[PDB]
């Protein structure tokens, strides 16, 4: 349901409505926000730096 491009676009849009349900979906699949296949591959940027930059 939630992937890296979709989550990045959602957090860049600065709306805490489409990101609802990310926590249950992430915990059921036994994932983490810091997984390599979940963050930006070129640099290592995660959702929090993307939110701060797109403030």
UniProtKB/Swiss-Prot annotation:
Cysteine disulfide partners in this protein: none
Entry comment describing in which tissues the protein is expressed: Found in the synoviocytes from patients with (RA) and without (CTR) rheumatoid arthritis (at protein level).
Post-translational modification (record): N-glycosylated.
Cell location: Cell membrane; Apical cell membrane; Cell junction, Adherens junction; Cell projection, Cilium
UniProt: ATP binding residues: 45, 50, 54
Superkingdom of the organism of origin: Eukaryota
Coiled coil: none
Subunit and interaction comment: Homotetramer. Self-associates in an isoform-specific manner. Isoform 1 and isoform 5 can oligomerize, but isoform 2, isoform 4 and isoform 6 cannot oligomerize. Interacts with calmodulin. Interacts with Map7 and Src family Tyr protein kinases LYN, SRC, FYN, HCK, LCK and YES. Interacts with CTNNB1. The TRPV4 and CTNNB1 complex can interact with CDH1. Interacts with PACSIN1, PACSIN2 and PACSIN3 (via SH3 domain). Part of a complex containing MLC1, AQP4, HEPACAM and ATP1B1. Interacts with ITPR3.
UniProt comment concerning the protein's domains: The ANK repeat region mediates interaction with Ca(2+)-calmodulin and ATP binding. The ANK repeat region mediates interaction with phosphatidylinositol-4,5-bisphosphate and related phosphatidylinositides.
Associated pathology: Brachyolmia 3: A form of brachyolmia, a clinically and genetically heterogeneous skeletal dysplasia primarily affecting the spine and characterized by a short trunk, short stature, and platyspondyly. BCYM3 is an autosomal dominant form with severe scoliosis with or without kyphosis, and flattened irregular cervical vertebrae.
Family listed: Belongs to the transient receptor (TC 1.A.4) family. TrpV subfamily. TRPV4 sub-subfamily.
Protein task: Non-selective calcium permeant cation channel involved in osmotic sensitivity and mechanosensitivity. Activation by exposure to hypotonicity within the physiological range exhibits an outward rectification. Also activated by heat, low pH, citrate and phorbol esters. Increase of intracellular Ca(2+) potentiates currents. Channel activity seems to be regulated by a calmodulin-dependent mechanism with a negative feedback mechanism. Promotes cell-cell junction formation in skin keratinocytes and plays an important role in the formation and/or maintenance of functional intercellular barriers. (Microbial infection) Facilitates hepatitis C virus (HCV) replication, possibly through its action on DDX3X.
Record protein name field: Transient receptor potential cation channel subfamily V member 4
Full-length numbering of the shown residues: 148 to 202 of 871
């Amino acid at each position: 349901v939630f992937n890296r491009p979709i989550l990045f676009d959602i957090v860049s849009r600065g709306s805490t409505a489409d990101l609802d349900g990310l926590l249950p979906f992430l915990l059921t699949h036994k994932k983490r926000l810091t997984d390599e296949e979940f963050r930006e591959p070129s640099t290592g940027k995660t959702c929090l730096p993307k939110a701060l930059l797109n403030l």
